[PDB]
Design a protein around this ligand. Structure first.
Ligand code: PRH
Ligand code: ZN
Length: 349
């Protein structure tokens, strides 16, 4: 069933884990990269999940397939292409994708990932691939893509870099810096490299967001809002613990990015206790429903929206209004945003 059928907005997703089993498959068996499987479903059935695991675990599923794709120059622009694809197939007019240059290489990179080998490929290029691949994909699917570049919790050394990336790819196609990776690393969201790079962001314009919340304490969010300056909270579930912090973001007017089906699956949730998502709906705080990782969880944007009208009862009347908010919170000029607001507005309504 539809389950929401008007033209959606989406803010939280990762390139990384918006690949199809096939493009993996190709490259494993093409530049040779001994892969973990064969039948395109078996690939899926190692890569993805169904019993709720733990955030740490989630995060090394990734080590299964990435080698495949990592630099090869080729693949960057192709999996950027096929990703815009999926985003016009399930219902979306507007997406922000995130990703991590650092995972996507090759050269420089003194902790060299997966682990793999030297090296044409740079941060400076593994972006300018994607911008074409989301510019193309845009061109050919009806959907406008802007990307988000992700600092990455466990490596502060690299965070510095991403701000220079964002600044200078700024609009061709990047509208933002993020923080991503294991919440459990005690202290991570404060380490010097991160705050330094966020604050070259606020010192220099760059829009900010942080996965804070999810599977770690309310503190990690309090850090994120106040020390890092996060313009919107990447998940923000555990902010319902410090219930005076909670009234302070409801009050600041600020985006929670929920990821339903993701929540059960990483660990951020016990299925015995009402998910933060229905709460935000009761309180009417600006949230956005969302996908996070299509591949690793075996899903589609319909999966969230349907976990949400049938388990946790959701009017269409809500869906309407969250998809207006997400648009309101987008990292896109008031320019581009009056007119993506004119879209869903004269179509919901
Ligand atoms: O895409 C940047 C990184 O996002 C991480 N990722 C993706 N979704 C999530 C996540 N880490 C935690 N939160 C979840 O929302 C993976 O480490 C990936 O390398
Ligand atoms: Zn995420």
């Amino acid at each position: 069933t539809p389950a929401f059928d008007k033209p959606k907005v989406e803010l939280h997703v990762h390139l990384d884990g918006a690949i199809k089993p096939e493009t993996i498959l190709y490259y494993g068996k093409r530049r040779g990269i001994a892969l973990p499987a064969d039948t395109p479903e078996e690939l899926l059935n190692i890569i993805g999940m169904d019993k709720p695991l733990t955030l740490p675990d989630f995060l090394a599923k990734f080590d299964y397939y990435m080698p495949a794709i990592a630099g090869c120059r080729d693949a960057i622009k192709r999996i950027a292409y096929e990703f815009v694809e999926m985003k016009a197939k399930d219902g979306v007019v507007y997406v922000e994708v995130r990703y991590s240059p650092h995972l996507l290489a090759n050269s420089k990179v003194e902790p060299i990932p997966w682990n793999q080998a030297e090296g044409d490929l740079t941060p400076d290029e593994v972006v300018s691939l994607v911008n074409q691949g989301l510019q193309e994909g845009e061109r050919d699917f009806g959907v406008k893509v802007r990307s988000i570049l992700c600092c990455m919790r466990h490596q502060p050394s690299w965070s510095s870099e991403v701000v220079e990336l964002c600044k200078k790819y700024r609009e061709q196609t990047v509208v933002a810096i993020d923080l991503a990776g294991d919440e459990t690393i005690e202290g991570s969201s404060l380490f010097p490299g991160h705050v330094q790079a966020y604050a070259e962001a606020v010192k220099s314009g760059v829009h900010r967001t942080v996965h804070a919340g999810e599977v770690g304490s309310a503190n990690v969010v309090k850090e994120a809002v106040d020390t890092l300056k996060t313009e919107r909270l990447g998940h923000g579930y555990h902010t319902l613990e410090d219930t005076t912090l909670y009234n302070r973001l409801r009050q600041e007017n600020m985006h929670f990015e929920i990821c339903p089906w993701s929540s059960y699956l990483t660990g951020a949730w016990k299925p015995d206790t009402e998910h933060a998502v229905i709460r935000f709906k009761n309180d009417q705080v600006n949230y956005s429903l969302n996908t996070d990782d299509p591949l690793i969880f075996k899903s589609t944007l319909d999966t969230d929206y349907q976990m949400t009208k049938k388990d946790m009862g959701f009017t269409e009347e809500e869906f309407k209004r969250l998809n207006i908010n997400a648009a309101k919170s987008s990292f896109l000029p008031e320019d581009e945003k009056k007119e993506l607001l004119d879209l869903l507005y004269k179509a919901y309504r």
